[PDB]
Amino acid sequence: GKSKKWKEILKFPHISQCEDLRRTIDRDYCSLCDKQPIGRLLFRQFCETRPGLECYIQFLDSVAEYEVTPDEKLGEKGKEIMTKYLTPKSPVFIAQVGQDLVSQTEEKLLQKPCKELFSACAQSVHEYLRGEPFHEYLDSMFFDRFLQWKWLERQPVTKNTFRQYRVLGKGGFGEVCACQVRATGKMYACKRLEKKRIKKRKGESMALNEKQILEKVNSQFVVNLAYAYETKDALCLVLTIMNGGDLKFHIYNMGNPGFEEERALFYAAEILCGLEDLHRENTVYRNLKPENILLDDYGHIRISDLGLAVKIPEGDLIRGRVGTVGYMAPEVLNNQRYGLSPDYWGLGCLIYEMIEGQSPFRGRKEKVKREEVDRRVLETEEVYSHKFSEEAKSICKMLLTKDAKQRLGCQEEGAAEVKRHPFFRNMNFKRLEAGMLDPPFVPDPRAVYCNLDHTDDDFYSKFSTGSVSIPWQNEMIETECFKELNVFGPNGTLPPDLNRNHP
């Protein structure tokens, strides 16, 4: 599905064009060689040329496989890594680990294997690579290639860059298009916000707050921002596409009025991880309802509609009686000062609704005014049925604690205190975050689950920042554009674009 001339668009620039990039990019190990997807691949490719560095990459890979193995197979896996990497005369022996550190972990196998056993060793490895190996890579041709990729990442994005297919949902104050990148063939979802509506409504600050919150969070369970451009009539937001429906449709139309507890377990586990990634940026969501939980092609879920999200400054509280009738925590209803607690109250509502088939404070077959449902959220205690195990009852009651100070997860521990609840006793988060627990429902691919000033010029420049670094690099990799274009010379020789003699 790539454009006819895609190899011309993503054609590498001559390395001489990247001198300004070379002079300004910060040379941080974690960023260049790990966080940035393409940088990490280029650094690992550099270690393949050095015979002595190959073993360190293979070792860290095998440790990544160990962390995720299930407990009934860590003994044999822990042994396999020992006799291949940590024995003295091994085929691929690691030396910078230290004979004292291997002798310390060698006898740590004698005890109940830990999922994070090799954390000490792996960190000692990163210690070594941060030093000489990293500074050599900086003076290698692979880093010159990295600069070429950054030069492309930085190119301007416009209406031409994309290709709008038929609608993909709609909104009153903002359309939702399809937008596909012509050059790579990658699908997205556009959140077109026209300028005329926002200008007169005076919400420019709330459209920026949403764009920036989406830009900073990078989670497997929240919709990610990939591009932000302005067109001749609107400001656009290119986000992750979900073609699997929303959780409300699957609770009430697809499944019984509700789900099996084990199936609600899976979705709650992913939502919790989604909320945890937002809380790392000390950003609160406050819009947690079944409709905003979306399923993708594979069956996993992401949180959507961050328009009511707000980034709390560390150590401070905010006020705001916002949200949706029936999913607002008591501290929000009372217009008090709150932090992240509204999001754990929401999680309680979602787990309950998934298991029971109705809201904890409103019956599915009940007609109640918006004044009584609120009184219930503030006064009455919810009730449970035989659909809930004792574990399920517990976590819901603790999350639905009226007093936000005794509410589960609203302590100094954070989301960790929630992953520890007996409700998730049979859940292995390491494997869930690695994405190798099969979802309980897989959507069929063929399914369909449904005028100018100057003060605006400065606001538009702050919004239309262009492509987002990590999502863009991931796109290049997924579409195999990196595999095809990332071509060096025969027998480790400098290609033309990387030779400063003849441009």
Ligand X SMILES: COC[C@H](C)NC(=O)c1c(C)[nH]c(/C=C2\C(=O)N=C3CC=C(C(=O)N[C@H](C)c4ccccc4)C=C32)c1C
Shortest Å distance, C-beta 243 to ligand X: 4
Shortest Å distance, C-beta 363 to ligand X: 26
Q: Decide whether 113 or 346 has the Cβ nearer to ligand X.
A: 346
Shortest Å distance, C-beta 373 to ligand X: 23
> Which residues contribute to the site for ligand X (CB under 6 A)?
168-169, 171, 174, 176, 189, 191, 223, 239-243, 245-246, 294, 304-305, 307, 447-450
Q: Decide whether 171 or 496 has the Cβ nearer to ligand X.
A: 171
Shortest Å distance, C-beta 296 to ligand X: 8
What does the alpha-carbon distance between residue 427 and residue 121 come to, in Å, rounded to a whole number?
27
Q: How crowded is residue 23: how many other Cβ atoms within 10 Å of its Cβ? A: 7
What does the alpha-carbon distance between residue 368 and residue 392 come to, in Å, rounded to a whole number?
27
Q: Decide whether 157 or 237 has the Cβ nearer to ligand X.
A: 237
Q: Decide whether 191 or 300 has the Cβ nearer to ligand X.
A: 191
What does the alpha-carbon distance between residue 16 and residue 344 come to, in Å, rounded to a whole number?
52
Cβ partners under 8 Å of residue 165, min gap 6: 177, 178, 179, 180
What does the alpha-carbon distance between residue 251 and residue 228 come to, in Å, rounded to a whole number?
33
Q: Decide whether 467 or 486 has the Cβ nearer to ligand X.
A: 467
Shortest Å distance, C-beta 24 to ligand X: 32
Nearest to 68 by CA among 116, 121, 122, 119: 116
Shortest Å distance, C-beta 177 to ligand X: 10
Shortest Å distance, C-beta 274 to ligand X: 13
Shortest Å distance, C-beta 469 to ligand X: 19
Q: Decide whether 148 or 304 has the Cβ nearer to ligand X.
A: 304
Give the rounded distance of the alpha carbon of 184 from its chain centre: 21
Shortest Å distance, C-beta 288 to ligand X: 13
Shortest Å distance, C-beta 42 to ligand X: 31
Q: How deeply is 456 buried, as exposed, middle or buried, from its count of CB atoms within 10 A (0-12, 13-18, 19+)?
A: middle
Cβ partners under 8 Å of residue 480, min gap 6: none
What does the alpha-carbon distance between residue 276 and residue 274 come to, in Å, rounded to a whole number?
5
Q: Decide whether 294 or 354 has the Cβ nearer to ligand X.
A: 294
What does the alpha-carbon distance between residue 453 and residue 365 come to, in Å, rounded to a whole number?
52
Alpha helices in 10-140 (DSSP H): 19-24, 29-30, 37-47, 51-68, 74-81, 99-106, 119-130, 132-138
What does the alpha-carbon distance between residue 100 and residue 334 come to, in Å, rounded to a whole number?
59
What does the alpha-carbon distance between residue 367 and residue 18 come to, in Å, rounded to a whole number?
65
Q: Decide whether 2 or 191 has the Cβ nearer to ligand X.
A: 191
Q: Decide whether 147 or 235 has the Cβ nearer to ligand X.
A: 235
What does the alpha-carbon distance between residue 284 and residue 341 come to, in Å, rounded to a whole number?
8
Q: Decide whether 113 or 307 has the Cβ nearer to ligand X.
A: 307
Shortest Å distance, C-beta 380 to ligand X: 30
Q: Decide whether 288 or 418 has the Cβ nearer to ligand X.
A: 288
What does the alpha-carbon distance between residue 287 and residue 292 come to, in Å, rounded to a whole number?
8
Shortest Å distance, C-beta 1 to ligand X: 17
Per-residue b or e along 52-84, where b marks 16 or more CB atoms closer than 10 Å to that residue's CB: ebebbbbbbebbeebbbbeeeebeebbeebbeb
CA–CA–CA angle 66, 437, 112 (5° rounding)? 35
Give the number of C-alpha atoms closer than 13 A to the C-alpha of residue 241, restricted to the C-beta side: 17
Helices 37-47 & 51-68 angle (0-180, nearest 10): 130
Q: Decide whether 192 or 421 has the Cβ nearer to ligand X.
A: 192
Q: How deeply is 341 buried, as exposed, middle or buried, from its count of CB atoms within 10 A (0-12, 13-18, 19+)?
A: buried
